[PDB]
Symmetry: C3
Subunit: 90 residues, 3 copies
Amino acid sequence: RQEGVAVLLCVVIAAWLDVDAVTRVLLISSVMLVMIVELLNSAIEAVVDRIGSEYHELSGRAKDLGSAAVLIAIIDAVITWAILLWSHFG
Amino acid sequence: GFTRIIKAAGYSWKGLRAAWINEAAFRQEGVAVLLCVVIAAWLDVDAVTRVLLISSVMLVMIVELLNSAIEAVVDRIGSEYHELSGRAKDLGSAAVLIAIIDAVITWAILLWSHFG
Amino acid sequence: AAWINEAAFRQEGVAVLLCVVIAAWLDVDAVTRVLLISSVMLVMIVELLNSAIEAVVDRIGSEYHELSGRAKDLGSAAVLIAIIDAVITWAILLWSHF
Ligand SMILES: CCCCCCCC/C=C\CCCCCC(=O)OC[C@H](O)CO
Ligand SMILES: CCCCCCCC/C=C\CCCCCC(=O)OC[C@H](O)CO
């Protein structure tokens, strides 16, 4: 459950930085989206494990698609922070 | 290509219709989202601010719908109590509350900055 | 990643990819650029979650159940709202750009 640490740290950094309201909303939203997509991904895999523990083509497919989503949200969070911090310190 | 969109649009309308017919809470939420999109559309704000007010509430809807999809799968498997059944719905509901709080705060921060 | 080799995801993925490349090249401010990019990436995220759910449903069986269709429809509706949000975002932001 160390994932909440990452989120708190981001909010602390965002508050610590001297940025406008819009920038701060984007920095924190992007982190919040990651959290949302991870929880939705964990729900899906909970359902997969509820159906059965044995392997199946569609169970793996479900988990692979869920994980890819989390990855996309993570990439989007990193791009956001990079772009905004580059602009703030430009 | 064109046939794939028409079919998916049909499924999408059945989905909005079912969620709407089935629950008062969903209807009232959809009311709240449409009021926010309208208010954001008429506010004298910059374009980026306008987008954030709209996106934050639309995200509420997206997560609401995705979570209702998972609830339907869990209820599809069985209405009987199960640990992963309860857990799936718990993680799903958390995701909905996060998005809703994030929208409320976003609206509070931006409208406070716009007004005074 | 056997799913990225399908025509459905490829057509949706390549569209999102182009929008991110266009956004990367546009002459706009930073917060505008972040918004253009993250809105089309949200389409991709939701579209992946929707296929995950569809996969779980098909996992259960080929027999039809009302909640099976409902799960798939609600997933499709989520994708639709995400797409609308992306179109709205690009419209509002690039209308001003002119
Ligand atoms: C495959 C992933 C990427 C590779 C791993 C990371 C490598 C980072 C190394 C050097 C930093 C170069 C300069 C970075 C700063 C930079 O680009 O500043 C311009 C402004 O961003 C324009 O606004
Ligand atoms: C996946 C490959 C990663 C490869 C590593 C680099 C990733 C840099 C992040 C975003 C690029 C967006 C476009 C960059 C230029 C850009 O946005 O400049 C204006 C800014 O707003 C600063 O003022």
